[PDB]
Design a protein around this ligand. Sequence first.
Ligand SMILES: O=C(O)c1ccccc1O
Ligand SMILES: [Zn+2]
Length: 259
Amino acid sequence: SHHWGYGKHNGPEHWHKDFPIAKGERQSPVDIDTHTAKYDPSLKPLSVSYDQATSLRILNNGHAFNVEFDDSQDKAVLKGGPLDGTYRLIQFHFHWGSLDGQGSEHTVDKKKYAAELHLVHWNTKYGDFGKAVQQPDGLAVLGIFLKVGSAKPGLQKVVDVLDSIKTKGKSADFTNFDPRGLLPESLDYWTYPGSLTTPPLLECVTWIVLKEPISVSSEQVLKFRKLNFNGEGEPEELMVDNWRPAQPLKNRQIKASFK
Ligand SMILES: O=C(O)c1ccccc1O
Ligand SMILES: [Zn+2]
């Protein structure tokens, strides 16, 4: 049967047939043109409070892998930056390429990074994630670019569990993972209003994209590329190039927290 994905017959250019909002006015990702983004001195520093984070499980969902968190309390939250109120971390995942020259969803002056990390948070004033994705300020996604260079020590625990979730539908216990080990040194950022980048493509996201990439080693991103989109017992299709390309910016402003 048919299902959305990243192949020739079901990739991003097809998604609008199943999810018409794919051609909407607030779609993500976008290219970040650094000479059009404006420094906004009213933006606050981003406040990342992850000290009490409780990771639970890691899941291969047939499109990427999600590291899931306990979001029943304000244990891992994002405040400040462009945001009003408190946004709770629910999961993170990545998008990556088949080659080091592509894989990111956002681009910076058309530059593609090897991968992009998305830490997904929902606005606590809406009570749960499902209600938050019915609201224009329901979600905040912290996006972090990955370039290939030196290894990221805080990523290695993720890399080493991937063999146990090779195929679609597999999950593994994944407790005591500290997402602070995935941050770069600087929290300077760009921000703009956008959407989820996979179906259902809902236009609920305040994007916060960090200026500084993290470095990961070639071996680390190689292990991402050994995952499978297919389920166990089906023919192997490598999980690579699970990124949506840049979408039209339309009426939107990208702001910078730094100059
Ligand atoms: O980030 C996405 O594209 C996404 C899609 C569906 C559900 C949760 C999500 O974070
Ligand atoms: Zn994503």
